[PDB]
Ligand binder design. Structure first.
Ligand SMILES: O=C(O)C(=O)Cc1ccc(O)cc1
Ligand SMILES: [Pr+3]
Length: 357
C-alpha cells in the first residue's frame, strides 16, 4: 500500500553541488503521507540527459512509480519531463526548464521561473545606473532561457545588450569569452550558470580588471559560490529563493515556518551556512506531495494509472501550497505557480550572503 516516488538527481559531475543538497534534504521530508508509507528510489544521473532518461524510464515501468522527481540541472530535467509526459506520470522538476506543450501536462516545477528572477535583477540594474549589459552563460537551454529573458525584459526596460558569449558546462576556462566581454565594457554583466561554474566567470572577470556590476542567477545560491569565488564574490547581485533567509522574513510569510524547519534540520547536520537554494527544492516537492496525496487517495489507490491522474488533477485544484521557496498555485498553463513571495535579492559582504532590501 506504499506510494512510490522515483527521484533522479545529480550527485556526481560538475553539478554535484546542486544534487547533493537535494538528495541530502530527503532525510528531512515525511516518509508517511496520507496514512501510507512512502517508498523512495533515489538515483544519481551525473547530470547526463541519457542517464536521466534511463532512470526516469525505469521508475515509471519497473518501479511503477506514482510520482517522479528531478533532475538537478536543465538538460536532464528536460529528459525526465519528456518521459513523464509520454508515460503519463506526475513529475516534480528540481531545475527550471522550458515548459512547452509537450511538457506542461505532467510536469510542475519547484525552482523559480527565469522571468521572475530576471525581473528582480533588471529592476536593480535600472535603479543602479546600468545602461549596457553583457551576458555569459551555458551553451544550452538553461543559458538560452536566461539570455532570452535578459533581452526581452531588458530591452523593454531600456537596457541595451552589447555582448553575448557562451561556454559549455564542463569548461574550466572562459578566457576567450571574458576577453570579448571586457573589450565591450558593459556597465553590468549577467552570468547564466550554476554551482561551481557560476563562480568561473565571477573570478575571471575580476581578475581581468572588469569593474562593472556582476549579476548571478538563482543557480548560484549556495555557499559553494562564496567558497570558490572568494574576494571576487563581493558585491555580486544574486537572485535567490527565500529559503536563503527565513530568519529575515515577517512571521506573516507562509514560507517562514517551512524555511526554518528545513534549515534547522539541514544546518544541524551539515554545519553553519549549509543551507541552499537546492535543498529547498526537494524539501518543497514533499510539501507539495503532502497536499496532493491525501486528495488523490479520495478517489484512487497507489500503483494505478488512476492515481497518477488523480495526483495530476490535485495539482490543479490544491492552491496556496506553502513551502520554503514560495507559495505554489499551479494551473494548466503555469507549471511554476509562483509569485513575488518566491524571491529575494542577495549580495555578498565580507564572505557572507546579505539581503538587498
Ligand atoms: O544549471 C542548470 O541547468 C540549472 O537549472 C540550475 C538551477 C537549478 C535550480 C535553480 O533554482 C536555479 C538554477
Ligand atoms: Pr476510482
Amino acid at each position: 500500500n506504499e506510494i512510490t516516488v522515483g527521484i533522479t538527481v545529480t550527485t556526481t559531475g560538475p553539478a554535484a553541488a546542486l544534487g547533493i543538497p537535494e538528495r541530502n534534504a530527503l532525510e528531512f521530508v515525511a516518509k508517511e503521507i496520507g496514512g501510507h508509507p512512502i517508498k523512495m528510489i533515489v538515483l544519481d544521473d551525473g547530470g547526463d540527459p541519457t542517464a536521466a532518461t534511463t532512470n526516469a524510464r525505469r521508475f515509471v515501468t519497473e518501479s511503477k512509480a506514482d510520482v517522479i522527481m528531478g533532475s538537478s540541472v536543465t538538460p536532464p530535467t528536460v529528459a525526465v519531463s519528456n518521459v513523464a509526459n509520454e508515460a503519463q506520470v506526475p513529475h516534480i522538476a528540481l531545475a527550471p526548464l522550458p515548459v512547452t506543450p509537450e511538457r506542461a501536462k505532467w510536469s510542475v516545477v519547484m525552482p523559480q521561473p527565469i522571468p521572475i528572477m530576471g525581473k528582480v535583477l533588471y529592476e536593480h540594474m535600472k535603479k543602479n545606473n546600468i545602461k549596457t549589459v553583457g551576458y555569459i552563460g551555458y551553451s544550452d537551454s538553461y543559458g538560452d532561457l536566461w539570455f532570452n529573458d535578459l533581452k526581452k525584459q531588458g530591452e523593454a526596460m531600456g537596457l541595451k545588450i552589447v555582448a553575448e558569449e557562451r561556454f559549455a558546462r564542463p569548461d574550466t576556462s572562459v578566457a576567450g569569452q571574458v576577453l570579448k566581454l571586457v573589450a565591450a565594457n558593459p556597465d553590468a554583466i549577467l552570468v547564466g550558470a550554476s554551482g561551481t561554474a557560476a563562480a568561473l566567470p565571477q573570478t575571471a572577470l575580476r581578475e581581468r580588471g572588469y569593474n562593472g556590476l556582476i549579476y548571478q542567477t538563482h543557480g548560484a545560491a549556495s555557499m559553494d559560490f562564496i567558497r570558490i569565488a572568494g574576494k571576487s564574490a563581493e558585491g555580486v547581485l544574486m537572485a535567490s529563493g527565500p529559503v536563503m533567509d527565513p530568519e529575515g522574513q515577517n512571521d506573516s510569510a507562509l514560507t517562514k515556518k517551512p524555511g526554518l524547519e528545513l534549515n534547522t534540520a539541514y544546518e544541524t547536520k551539515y554545519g553553519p551556512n549549509s543551507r541552499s537554494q537546492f535543498a529547498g527544492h526537494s524539501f518543497d516537492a514533499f510539501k507539495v506531495l503532502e497536499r496532493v496525496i491525501p486528495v488523490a487517495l479520495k478517489t484512487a489507490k497507489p500503483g494505478t494509472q488512476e492515481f497518477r491522474e488523480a495526483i495530476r488533477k490535485a495539482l490543479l485544484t490544491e492552491k496556496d501550497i506553502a513551502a520554503s521557496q514560495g507559495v505554489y498555485s499551479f494551473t494548466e498553463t503555469d507549471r511554476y505557480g509562483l509569485d513575488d513571495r518566491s524571491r529575494i535579492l542577495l549580495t555578498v559582504k565580507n564572505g557572507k550572503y546579505v539581503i538587498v532590501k
